[PDB]
Design a protein around this nucleic acid. Structure first.
Lengths: 186, 159, 173, 50, 50, 191, 59
RNA sequence: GAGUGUUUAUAGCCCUUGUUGUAAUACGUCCACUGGGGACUGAGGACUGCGGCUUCGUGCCAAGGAUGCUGACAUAAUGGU
RNA sequence: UCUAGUGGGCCAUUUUUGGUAAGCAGAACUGGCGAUGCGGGAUGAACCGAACGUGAGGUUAAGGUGCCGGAAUGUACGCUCA
RNA sequence: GAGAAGCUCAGACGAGUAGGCAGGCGUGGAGGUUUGUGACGAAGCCUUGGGCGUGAGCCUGGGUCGAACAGCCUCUAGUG
RNA sequence: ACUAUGGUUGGAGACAACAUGGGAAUCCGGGGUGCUGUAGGCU
């Protein structure tokens, strides 16, 4: 008998994407080789994010990319922006800057606006060819907690979270337990 | 046969010491407390106002808030499988500084002084404490201290 | 087997008394660790000293000066009974005081069901004068013309013939 | 560097002693067992356990 | 490595001899020589996991 | 194994102890008389009842009176029953004495000639007590704490003034006048 | 029979996942502090930010 | 024969110091000192490594896991049911 | 983040309360059974030892070595006739 | 090269009710595929024969039998 | 004194001994019978 506590035994990380996309598997195979044969943490980060699920790869907008690379103390003038996910369009930005963006997929409107503005859109294999180690690359992520489920996660007394309500308005969870005039307020 | 009063089972906990009743010393009100100070909680039975719960008696915490006549001692209490932060507002009569912090401050000052002195002298400093080392080798002498032979004493009546 | 050790110890010197006294004891223990344990056991009962607050400055095994000479050993002991405590005196004829102590322990265990933990050896001395001997059984062995028959024994055993299951003839005496 | 050296050394997986333990294994070495401090007798115990 | 091992062996013999002469000197003078307390201890677990 | 249960305001229904008198003999004794003491002491923790104490007191008193007379014993019962052992009524029932090991149960002081009489009396009194008891010949002068040799040296110096059964003993504490007036034979050593 | 309270397994259950310690954060919410202290610290922190911004802009 | 009453007489014990003598023996500890007997295992499958010997060579070795020399049977043996 | 089962417990050591006592009822600590096979106590849910993949070799724990039953009708000193 | 869903090296570990998860075995029907099996004998059944898998199970020899049946990738359920 | 840990320790039990550690109270005796910060007056 051996007295060993088994707490951190099974790793909780994906070693393979759940998707059955053949092209995604081809990208994973390419970046498995890149991560193994290069000492750059960028390739490992890309390979890890290739395994991630849809919720763990939130979309990003060209306005967000433009805002992040146009900061005053940024010096990200001509650097290529890389996101492992979908790049969406933001119609609120009437004029699109010239951006070099590499992503898994592009919205038709976003890709058209980038090309019309004079930028370039690249896939991950193209990004690997141009920057095999990720040099001079701005790696970005979308907002993970921007989805609906995180408005309700952690709901409880005095947590200020959104309840699961069939409808919205009076007569729907706006009574005893929500205000002082009705017994108590949460 | 169980009651949940605030001061239940505090008969000896909140008692004043023998020949220690009456006037409360006024140096307690003259002591200065700041946010971040480590203080001990010792409930005084004469001051009923601002009394902390019996659980916090004898505990140690950090002050986060300072008011006119009270402090904000912060404690961590076990409620099962976790610690929770308890923020108790306690009058300064039940609060005193921890002498360990004063000793630790003096130790830090001595360590820095030794560090600067060793840097000037160009030698080792040895700032890290060590546990009690095993006893070294000595040469205990017997002159004028000749050993005395001892024998077990026979049992006898001692009444 | 038991061994005899002399153990010299003292309290750890303090600010009050830089020169503590040295105390020596002659103890019978299977090994040095037990001898030191016995030394502290007896010292705790006499002086305000413990193992933590004291130290052992010397320990030496003692051998019999005359292991080839038959001697009479008088042993004074104090032992705890099931009811109370009694002091007794024993006499054993042996060549070593270690053997006399071992015989004393065996006799006490056989005749009083007294374990090692319940026996304290107060004193062991060697009897020199014939009239000093107290037990008549011991003193009867000092007769120069001593002659007794061979004590009864379970015949003569052999490593092979003793293990033999059957014998052709009944043994004689 | 005793701390680093000792931590690097994997704990020794000794076998059962050749010749066995004493009559009762779970009382103190002073009492006649195999527990507690035994001083230099650990060398003989390791000798029969190695 | 061989030079280090030779120096270590010489140190072991020198330490052992030095203790022997110090003990003999104490015996000759009639005083008592208390040696250095041990800094290394080997510990063996004798009880199971129950 | 029960917690101590003395007579208090919480339970005032404790019945009276069966044994009332505790001392028998020359209660107004003196220092010179009764120089030897004999003790009967239990060897273990028991719960001797007041009823058993009553029987032992009666037997000891009768035997000592008839065999040695009134003026040859000062027996007393050290045990005082305060603990209550409850018994269901057909709730306190009776009183028992809690005695540990080495606690004196019976103590008698007699003369040197009555040593055997006291030994015999306390030997016959063992049958009236639950458990095992032993008899010891005390080395102290009577019921006082001082041993025989210490007491005789104190008496020879003159530091003891009898006062009824007990006596007053000189100590190096207090005003000199209050002790010098009381003690004429006290030889204060100037050192 | 009801009222079967016991605490035999509660300590073992608590120690199975251990006694978790609260996450340490550099900044604590000022709602626990004095109202006057919090109100003044708002203006003090604000003025500090403008001073830093002005110094960086001039530099 | 049965008992003395003094210290080796025709015997012999006990206790001190001198040497031969650095006496042996027993015990404890150690030897990277050395001899035999018995049992179980042979995992891996070109080479690379760490060592030792060397005539200095893709040399030899007990050096990152067994090979070699023999014999009997083959309606026997070994396995499976 | 989501969710299952559970929400009748019991035994042993130690500290106890109520009871005449209980294989009784109720509290505290620890280890267990429940969900724990295996060696031992002739047997046994809790006791001792020890926590288990399929096997070979060696050595042990608790426990034993007259036969049943594997192992000294071993050694040394004593006591005991029922 | 070694189904990169692959190859190779090394270390530690292995009780389990209620309960959770994963990977697999078996059945009926549907789509695709296998110049798939079959009256020179399909399915089924019996077996004192053989083989594989830890196992759920599978393959095969012999006897009976007479008209349909199966392997692989998916779909599905009145599936043990 | 008491107490943490241990035994297939003793004892029918109460209890006790032992092993690795911690360690009182009370009594008695010896010594002593205020120290100190600030501001100012004093043959």
């Amino acid at each position: 008998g051996i007295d060993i506590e088994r707490h951190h035994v099974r790793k909780s990380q994906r070693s393979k994407p759940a998707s059955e996309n053949v092209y995604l598997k081809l990208l994973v195979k390419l970046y498995r080789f890149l991560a193994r044969r290069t000492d750059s943490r960028f390739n490992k980060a890309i390979l890890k994010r290739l395994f991630q699920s849809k919720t763990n790869r939130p979309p990003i907008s060209i306005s967000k990319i433009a805002a992040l690379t146009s900061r005053k103390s940024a010096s990200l003038e001509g650097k290529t922006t890389v996101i492992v996910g979908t790049v969406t369009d933001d119609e609120r930005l009437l004029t699109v800057p010239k951006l070099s963006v590499a992503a898994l997929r592009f919205t038709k409107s976003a890709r058209a606006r980038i090309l019309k503005a004079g930028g370039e859109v690249l896939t991950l294999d193209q990004l690997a060819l141009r920057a095999p180690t990720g040099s001079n690359t701005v790696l970005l992520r979308g907002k993970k907690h921007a989805r609906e489920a995180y408005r309700h996660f952690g709901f409880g007394p005095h947590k200020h979270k959104a309840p699961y309500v069939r409808s919205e308005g009076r007569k729907f969870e706006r009574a005893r337990g929500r205000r002082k005039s009705r017994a108590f307020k949460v | 046969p169980h009651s949940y009063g605030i001061r239940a089972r505090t008969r000896y906990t909140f008692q004043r010491g023998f020949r220690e009743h009456g006037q409360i010393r006024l140096s307690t009100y003259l002591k200065t407390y700041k946010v971040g100070d480590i203080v001990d909680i010792k409930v005084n039975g004469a001051v009923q106002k601002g009394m902390p719960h019996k659980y916090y008696h004898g505990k140690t915490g950090v002050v986060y808030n300072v008011t006119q006549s009270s402090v904000g001692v912060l404690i961590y209490k076990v409620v099962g499988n976790r610690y929770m932060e308890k923020r108790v507002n306690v009058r300064i009569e039940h609060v005193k500084h921890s002498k360990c912090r004063q000793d630790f401050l003096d130790r830090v000052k001595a360590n820095e002084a030794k560090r600067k002195e060793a840097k000037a002298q160009g030698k080792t400093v040895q700032l890290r404490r060590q546990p009690a080392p095993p006893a070294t080798a000595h040469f205990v002498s017997t002159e004028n201290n000749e050993p005395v032979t001892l024998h077990p004493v026979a049992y006898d009546t001692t009444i | 087997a038991l061994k005899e050790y002399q153990v010299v110890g003292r309290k750890v010197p303090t600010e009050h008394e830089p020169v503590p006294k040295l105390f020596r004891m002659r103890l019978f223990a299977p090994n040095e660790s037990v001898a030191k344990s016995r030394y502290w056991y007896f010292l705790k009962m006499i002086n305000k000293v413990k193992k933590a607050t004291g130290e052992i400055v010397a320990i030496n095994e003692i051998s019999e000066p005359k292991p080839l000479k038959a001697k009479v050993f008088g042993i004074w002991i104090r032992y705890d009974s099931r009811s109370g405590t009694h002091n007794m005196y024993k006499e054993f004829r042996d060549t070593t005081r270690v053997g006399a102590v071992e015989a004393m322990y065996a006799d006490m265990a056989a005749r009083h069901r007294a374990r090692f933990r319940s026996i304290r050896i107060l004193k062991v001395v060697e009897v020199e004068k014939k009239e000093d001997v107290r037990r008549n059984y011991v003193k009867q062995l000092l007769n120069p013309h001593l002659k007794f028959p061979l004590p009864h024994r379970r015949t003569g055993v052999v490593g092979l013939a003793g293990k033999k299951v059957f014998a052709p003839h009944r043994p004689s005496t | 560097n005793f701390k680093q050296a000792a931590n690097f050394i994997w704990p020794f997986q000794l076998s059962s002693p050749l010749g066995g333990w004493r009559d009762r294994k779970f009382k103190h070495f002073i009492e006649g067992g195999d527990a507690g401090k035994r001083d230099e007798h650990i060398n003989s115990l390791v000798r029969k356990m190695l | 490595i061989a030079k280090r091992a030779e120096s270590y062996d010489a140190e072991y013999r020198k330490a052992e001899r030095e203790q022997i002469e110090l003990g003999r000197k104490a015996r000759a003078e009639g005083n008592y020589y208390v040696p250095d307390e041990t800094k290394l201890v080997f510990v063996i677990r004798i009880r199971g996991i129950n | 194994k029960n917690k101590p249960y003395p007579k208090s305001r919480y339970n005032r229904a404790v019945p009276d102890s069966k044994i009332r008198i505790f001392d028998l003999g020359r209660k107004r004794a003196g220092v010179d008389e009764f120089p030897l003491c004999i003790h009967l002491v239990s060897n273990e923790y028991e719960q001797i009842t007041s009823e058993a104490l009553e029987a032992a007191r009666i037997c000891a008193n009768k035997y000592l009176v008839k065999i040695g007379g009134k003026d040859s014993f000062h027996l007393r019962v050290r045990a005082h029953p305060f603990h209550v052992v409850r018994i269901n009524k057909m709730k306190p029932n009776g009183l028992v004495a809690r005695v540990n090991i080495g606690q004196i149960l019976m103590s008698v002081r007699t003369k040197d000639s009555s040593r055997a009489t006291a030994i015999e009396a306390l030997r016959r009194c063992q049958y009236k007590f639950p458990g095992q008891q032993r008899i010891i010949v005390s080395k102290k002068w009577g019921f006082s704490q001082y041993a025989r040799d210490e007491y005789i040296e104190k008496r020879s110096r003159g530091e003891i003034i009898p006062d009824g059964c007990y006596a007053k003993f000189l100590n190096k504490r207090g005003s000199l006048q209050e002790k010098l007036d009381l003690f004429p034979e006290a030889s204060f050593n100037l050192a | 029979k009801s009222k079967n309270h016991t605490n035999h397994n509660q300590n073992k259950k608590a120690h199975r996942n251990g006694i978790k310690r609260p996450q340490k954060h550099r900044y604590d919410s000022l709602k626990y502090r004095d109202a006057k202290f919090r109100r003044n610290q708002k203006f003090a922190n604000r003025g500090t930010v403008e001073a830093i911004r002005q110094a960086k802009a001039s530099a």
